[PDB]
Amino acid sequence: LAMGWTNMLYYTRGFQQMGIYAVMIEKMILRDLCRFMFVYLVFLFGFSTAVVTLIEDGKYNSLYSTCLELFKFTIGMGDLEFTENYDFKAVFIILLLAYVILTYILLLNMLIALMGETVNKIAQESKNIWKLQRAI
Amino acid sequence: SYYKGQTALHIAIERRNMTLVTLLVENGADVQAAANGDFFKKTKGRPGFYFGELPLSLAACTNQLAIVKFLLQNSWQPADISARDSVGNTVLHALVEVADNTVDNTKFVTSMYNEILILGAKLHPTLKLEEITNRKGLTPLALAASSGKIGVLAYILQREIHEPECRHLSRKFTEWAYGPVHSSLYDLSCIDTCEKNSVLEVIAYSSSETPNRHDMLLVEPLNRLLQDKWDRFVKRIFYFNFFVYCLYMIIFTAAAYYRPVEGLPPYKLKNTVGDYFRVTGEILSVSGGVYFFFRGIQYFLQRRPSLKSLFVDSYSEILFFVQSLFMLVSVVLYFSQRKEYVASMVFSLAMGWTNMLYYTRGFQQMGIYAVMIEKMILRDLCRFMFVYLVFLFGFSTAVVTLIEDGKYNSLYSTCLELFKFTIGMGDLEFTENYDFKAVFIILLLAYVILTYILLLNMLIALMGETVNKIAQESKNIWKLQRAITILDTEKSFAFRSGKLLQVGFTPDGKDDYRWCFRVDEVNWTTW
Amino acid sequence: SYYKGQTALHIAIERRNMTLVTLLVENGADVQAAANGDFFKKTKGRPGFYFGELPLSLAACTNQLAIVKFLLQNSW
Ligand SMILES: CCCCCCCC(=O)OC[C@H](COP(=O)(O)O[C@@H]1[C@H](O)[C@H](O)[C@@H](OP(=O)(O)O)[C@H](OP(=O)(O)O)[C@H]1O)OC(=O)CCCCCCC
Numbered sequence A: 001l002a003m004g005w006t007n008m009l010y011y012t013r014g015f016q017q018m019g020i021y022a023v024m025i026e027k028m029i030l031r032d033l034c035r036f037m038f039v040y041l042v043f044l045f046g047f048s049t050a051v052v053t054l055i056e057d058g059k060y061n062s063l064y065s066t067c068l069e070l071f072k073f074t075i076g077m078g079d080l081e082f083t084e085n086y087d088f089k090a091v092f093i094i095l096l097l098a099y100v101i102l103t104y105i106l107l108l109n110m111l112i113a114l115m116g117e118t119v120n121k122i123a124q125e126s127k128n129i130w131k132l133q134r135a136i
Numbered sequence B: 001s002y003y004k005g006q007t008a009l010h011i012a013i014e015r016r017n018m019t020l021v022t023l024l025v026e027n028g029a030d031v032q033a034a035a036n037g038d039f040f041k042k043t044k045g046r047p048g049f050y051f052g053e054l055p056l057s058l059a060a061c062t063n064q065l066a067i068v069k070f071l072l073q074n075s076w077q078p079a080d081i082s083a084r085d086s087v088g089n090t091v092l093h094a095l096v097e098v099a100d101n102t103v104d105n106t107k108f109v110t111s112m113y114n115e116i117l118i119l120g121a122k123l124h125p126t127l128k129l130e131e132i133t134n135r136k137g138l139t140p141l142a143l144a145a146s147s148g149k150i151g152v153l154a155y156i157l158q159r160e161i162h163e164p165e166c167r168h169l170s171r172k173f174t175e176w177a178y179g180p181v182h183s184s185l186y187d188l189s190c191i192d193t194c195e196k197n198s199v200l201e202v203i204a205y206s207s208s209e210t211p212n213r214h215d216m217l218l219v220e221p222l223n224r225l226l227q228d229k230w231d232r233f234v235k236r237i238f239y240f241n242f243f244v245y246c247l248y249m250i251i252f253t254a255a256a257y258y259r260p261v262e263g264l265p266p267y268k269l270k271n272t273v274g275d276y277f278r279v280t281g282e283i284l285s286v287s288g289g290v291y292f293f294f295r296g297i298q299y300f301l302q303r304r305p306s307l308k309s310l311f312v313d314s315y316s317e318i319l320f321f322v323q324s325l326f327m328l329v330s331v332v333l334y335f336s337q338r339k340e341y342v343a344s345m346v347f348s349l350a351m352g353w354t355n356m357l358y359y360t361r362g363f364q365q366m367g368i369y370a371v372m373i374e375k376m377i378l379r380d381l382c383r384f385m386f387v388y389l390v391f392l393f394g395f396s397t398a399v400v401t402l403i404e405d406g407k408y409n410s411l412y413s414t415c416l417e418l419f420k421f422t423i424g425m426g427d428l429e430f431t432e433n434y435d436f437k438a439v440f441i442i443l444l445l446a447y448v449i450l451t452y453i454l455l456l457n458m459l460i461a462l463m464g465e466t467v468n469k470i471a472q473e474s475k476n477i478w479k480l481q482r483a484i485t486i487l488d489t490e491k492s493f494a495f496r497s498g499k500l501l502q503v504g505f506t507p508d509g510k511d512d513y514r515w516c517f518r519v520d521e522v523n524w525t526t527w
Numbered sequence C: 001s002y003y004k005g006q007t008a009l010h011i012a013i014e015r016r017n018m019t020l021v022t023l024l025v026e027n028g029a030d031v032q033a034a035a036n037g038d039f040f041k042k043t044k045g046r047p048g049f050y051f052g053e054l055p056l057s058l059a060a061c062t063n064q065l066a067i068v069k070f071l072l073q074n075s076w
């Protein structure tokens, strides 16, 4: 059902502006999201392993729970105090602050910048690809 | 001492008067006097002009072609062509020195270089000026590579000569031509392997002080060489290293995730399979840590940075070394019956997972992305962090001074509460222990408007500008990063190219081979 | 096998010498020989140049208008 509702976007061709928009989405997915996702997953996994190793026991002593907690920061819902089952508070805070500064403040904004560059670069190519999509 | 050493020949050559030069040469004045005055020294004060300290070099470096012709074709006292000054530089060395990467300057320097080379071939066919090395132990090509003289290096690496008895001087050749396609040969003599210093290792290991270290490798033969070596063997070696590092990090993660958590290490060895595997994993991780520590030590000993490029170059090396230091401190704490070994090892684990990003080179797009990350961290995050920390500390102090008592009466708690706004989790009502609500709200609103709405968005804008500005520079830096990887892979322990014949006869009877590297190009005009 | 199939017509056309081309055509050398050498093949190795494997095509593909005029307007 979800796949079908997303595939609804195929018929966006046949209308010039929406077709160009969809072609741009396709290019962005291919390049920028892929590179960003690789680097972001590396950082998230590394810091999640460090944090979960630090924790002694409790609800968040599993890799999945801590990975979800770390991911919540990306969507503007990070807690910074989601647990207290550790021996060293300074290490916990330093790890969390480093992860935040490295991903939330740096990588997301750089992704915005690179998206802007790509948008600047691929206008005529997007129009030509839309024309080819309509010819097919 | 300042002007001392000058003779009338120097003044005559400077003023550019042929008649006076000839008349003065009639008397027989020596044409080998060296001007050692400080004005003629390299950089002894802002005033000065280095020209090699000889009349021949002075003529060569000041648009005096007729004068150098005369000095080399005068019967009374012919001018020596191999003469070396106090610094050890010859005429070609001085010509390289005076180059400054300007269109007219480069044109003249290359033209005089070629003319003097041809003249030296004519008068002294046996002598080869290109091998004369100054007191520093550098040939003119090595000097050009080290000094950052892009134009001279480009001219030298691909010069062609088409005159009788002096075609052997050329470095590029033409093996064969058929229709619009012809094959050219480049001389790899003393470019990739020289056993004392070569163009590639001189360029790659040059300190950041050198002007055009990034753009130097864009000269055709060097780029072709680097790509050829990569595709030949370095790609596979690099892939194997990347795979081994991934396995090591996985083993380290698995060992750390299953630590026994019982109190006051060291811990005993329970007779079970899992405990045996955990012990093996931690031994392997410690072995990797010591290996990286020793690698960093020998790197520092060999390169021997100037103690300032440490903070400007070799970021990867220092990061790997710091990871190893954390691991070693962790081991020492562990065997000393302390719990802080866990803190050290988690720091090391996070550092290693981030250092995983080093192997992003070897893939063009990801390498460019990583270079961009490095630039952004150096510039934009640093400036933003300074200003943001100032604002955050000031407003935190104001707020915590306002509060009377409670949980948030400490500087740390209020700083954390103020920081939560930056990540989209600010409360605006986190406390009520104050006398004035209006002051509290005004302070919080001012802090929000100043940071969240203004500085973050301006950071996005400046990041966009920087991204717009640093594309080609990022690609060049990635190319340099891959060249360094290739050279290090070779040095840790392949040859140049096929041996071939190009001239068939040197000025002497015997012939020569010069380890050429083939390139094929297609032309559709100028038949 | 590499250069095999070439005839003197191909060399004459390549060097762009009308006089030699005419003199060689006087003898009556066939103008339909096909050069099947690997150098003349499409992509059999980095060295090579595809031109169609005929003197007419070689003239057409190498700025030889007078030569193709001659080959198409020769009585012999
Ligand atoms: C405070 C931290 C400082 C270290 C981080 C510094 C920020 C950062 O992103 O790391 C860079 C490092 C690559 O550095 P690496 O030394 O190998 O590459 C060189 C580096 O860029 C130097 O500045 C120059 O050295 P040199 O001229 O040839 O002699 C030259 O570039 P340029 O400047 O001349 O144009 C490059 O050759 O990448 C990682 O491996 C770690 C993964 C990133 C993880 C980042 C997490 C911090």
Ligand code: NA
Pocket (backbone or CB within 6 Å): A075, A076, A077, B423, B424, B425
């Ligand atoms: Na939020």
